[PDB]
Paper text:
The B cell lymphoma 2 (Bcl-2) family of proteins are key regulators of intrinsic apoptosis. The antiapoptotic protein myeloid cell leukemia 1 (Mcl-1), which is associated with high tumor grade, poor survival, and resistance to treatment, has emerged as a promising candidate for treating hematological and solid cancers. The binding interaction is driven by the four hydrophobic residues (L210, L213, V216, and V220 in Mcl-1) in the conserved BH3 domain which bind to four corresponding hydrophobic pockets (P1-4) on the antiapoptotic members. ,− To achieve potent cellular efficacy, Mcl-1 inhibitors require exceptionally low binding affinities (subnanomolar). Herein, we report the structure-guided design of small molecule macrocyclic Mcl-1 inhibitors based on the (R)-methyl-dihydropyrazinoindolone scaffold our group has previously disclosed.
An X-ray cocrystal structure of acyclic inhibitor 8 and Mcl-1 was obtained and is illustrative of the potential benefits of macrocyclization in this series. Two copies of compound 8 bound to Mcl-1 were present in the asymmetric unit, with unambiguous electron density maps of the ligand molecules suggesting two different binding poses of compound 8. The superimposed structures of these two ligand binding poses show a different orientation of the indole 2-carboxylic acid moiety while the other parts of compound 8 remains the same. Figure B,B1 show the favored binding pose, which represents the conformation adopted by the indole 2-carboxylic acid moiety of the ligand in the majority of the cocrystal structures we have obtained in the program. This binding pose provides optimal overlap between the Arg263 residue and the indole ring resulting a cation–π interaction. Additionally, the 2-carboxylic acid moiety forms a polar interaction with the Asn260 side chain. However, as we occasionally observed in our X-ray cocrystals, the ligand may also adopt a binding pose where the indole 2-carboxylic acid is rotated 180° around the C–N amide bond (C1). This binding pose is accompanied by a modest shift in the left-hand portion of the Mcl-1 loop region to accommodate the 2-carboxylic acid moiety, which now forms a hydrogen bonding interaction with the Val258 backbone NH. Inspection of the cocrystal structure of 8 and Mcl-1 shows there is an accessible shelf region that is already partially occupied by the indole 2-carboxylic acid N-substituent (N-ethyl methyl ether in the case of 8) that the tether could occupy.
Residue numbers in the entry: 172 to 321
The structure:
């Protein structure tokens, strides 16, 4: 319903902005405040996650050997495997998206900007499908911004 659309808007905006390598502060949609604040939080926490896990991110990127949109279509399986284990929390969700931004920068490097939208959708699809009930219990992105945004 609303949860998918809002998630996709947040994730797509962050991956896109990360790939161009400058912030975009165009406002969001109707639920403008929450989505804006979630995006600001992703910039802060997400950028730190990428720095912290530079090595593992780099090693994993290399093993994924991404070239084109067909590869992008084939990322979902490893993504699901690595994320749908065990504990759910917002830090883990930021880690999933942060790895998404890391790949999106690579896609830019190899002139595969067309793939960034499919990537974001694939991330959103996995997030909302596997964690729907938990996300609803937290009041979704409101729960994220309420407690994590500074
Ligand atoms: C130890 O953690 C087990 C899993 N886990 C549990 C739990 O209970 O299982 C709780 C918990 C809490 C947090 C905050 C984080 C983790 N992690 C820590 C590690 C295991 N991770 C996690 C993620 C996020 C989920 C997948 O995102 C993806 C996103 C995209 C766009 C693609 Cl295309 C793909 C293929 C994957 C990682 C992403 C990349 C790497 Cl490179 C590592 C990564 C790092 C870093 N080091 N190494 C060796 C790898 C392989 C990742 C994760 O969710 C947690």
């Amino acid at each position: 319903d609303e949860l998918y659309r809002q998630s996709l808007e947040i994730i797509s905006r962050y991956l896109r902005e990360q790939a161009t390598g400058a912030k975009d502060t165009k406002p969001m949609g109707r639920s403008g405040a929450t989505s804006r604040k979630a995006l600001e939080t992703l910039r802060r926490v997400g950028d730190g996650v990428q720095r912290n896990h530079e090595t593992a991110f780099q090693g994993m990127l290399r093993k994924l050997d991404i070239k084109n949109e067909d590869d992008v279509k084939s990322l979902s399986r490893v993504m699901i495997h690595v994320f749908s284990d065990g504990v759910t929390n917002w830090g883990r969700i930021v880690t999933l998206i942060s790895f998404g931004a890391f790949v999106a920068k690579h896609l830019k490097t190899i002139n595969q900007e067309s793939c960034i939208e499919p990537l974001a959708e694939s991330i959103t699809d996995v997030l909302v499908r596997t964690k729907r009930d938990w996300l609803v219990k937290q009041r979704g992105w409101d729960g994220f911004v309420e407690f994590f945004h500074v």
